[PDB]
Design a protein around this ligand. Structure first.
Ligand SMILES: O=C(O)CON=C1c2cc(Br)ccc2-c2ccc(Br)cc21
Lengths: 115, 116, 116, 115
């Protein structure tokens, strides 16, 4: 599992559950091509997005659909979604974990890259 | 200004200076149209991107070119940019300050919204 | 000012207003002595805590009373405060801006340090 | 394991390894009494700090010794240490995870409280 996404709710101090996540890969014509997607689990995590074979070097975008998450909680948010855009590199460690910490008017995102 | 972008460097404890910022607005055909752009000042701030007249209701994307910033300091960072996508002025005109705090493998983006 | 504290609310996208801030300085006997205190303004900022004369080298603690802030908004938060502990002026006088961004179960604290 | 601490390095995109962590509990005379301590593992985590029996309601402080971490990396940091002060509550979920994301001149800390 070379790509995992983890989402936390900073308002409730809890995993952000049932958050839609869409991954895209940049195509040769500079458009974003759908690559993988899912919803975060009860632990705020999304695994099984891709395989080692398919996750080749390239530019990827992870969209986390934060607005719909906050709307479900009755909380008015700022962002439409959190975006994380990066180049996958074979030189570095083999596992990427994209973490996101969400508040209504702020988010932070961190990449933890390990072997 | 109705729209101001501020960028800070969490490694150096400084403003992030001369960072390129591109603003786009979503068109009726769902494409991202260019809206405004500039570079952060010595204070890490970018003012004068738009006017209250031109900054109508819509979905806007602020793209902060963080990779180029880090590379110039000798650092190879994780992200290509920091993106900030939001609906603006849907409840009438507001003033928006979009801040980003940058580290090589992490960033945070925050908005402060004030009613004139 | 050589020391400025800024506090923002990540739930509302606003300054955090009227937040109590206590500054302490570590004494020779390793105790925390009171140094300055105040409350954030309508802009979420607290200026005028100290002077360049009084703000000597030392270890300082800035305690931001976040629990009381959240409780007044009807929220029961996780943290009692946000604490910010740092050595100041060890390489000569510097200007320090300490910011805190608050959510009920999370906060971030950042420093921007500039040489006069 | 009712209390866990997890520390990440935002500069290197990696778990923050071998970081000293000291936990204190507030005594009746308002002093901080040493309660538990350890160093983060290769995964940036510290488990086994306390037990369900000993972790009673009260005010606790978790100090994360960030300055020594950065000094080891040759990076000049702002903070002496990251502090996290909170009241343990029996009404809520039974597990506290204190997470910290570290940069030289900034840190963020989040509590994830789950069952
Ligand atoms: O990283 C943190 O802990 C919070 O940082 N966010 C900041 C900030 C930090 C500092 Br230091 C100075 C000004 C601002 C600011 C000014 C405007 C807006 Br919007 C946000 C911020």
């Amino acid at each position: 599992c070379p790509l995992m996404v983890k989402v936390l709710d900073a308002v409730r101090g809890s995993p952000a559950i049932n958050v839609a996540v869409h991954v895209f890969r940049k195509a040769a014509d500079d458009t974003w091509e759908p690559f993988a997607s899912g919803k975060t689990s009860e632990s705020g995590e999304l695994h099984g997005l891709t395989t080692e074979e398919e996750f080749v070097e390239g530019i990827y975008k992870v969209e986390i659909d934060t607005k719909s998450y906050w709307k479900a909680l009755g909380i008015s948010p700022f962002h439409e979604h959190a975006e994380v855009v990066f180049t996958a590199n074979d030189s570095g460690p083999r596992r990427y974990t994209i973490a996101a910490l969400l508040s209504p008017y702020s988010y932070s995102t961190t990449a933890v890259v390990t072997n």
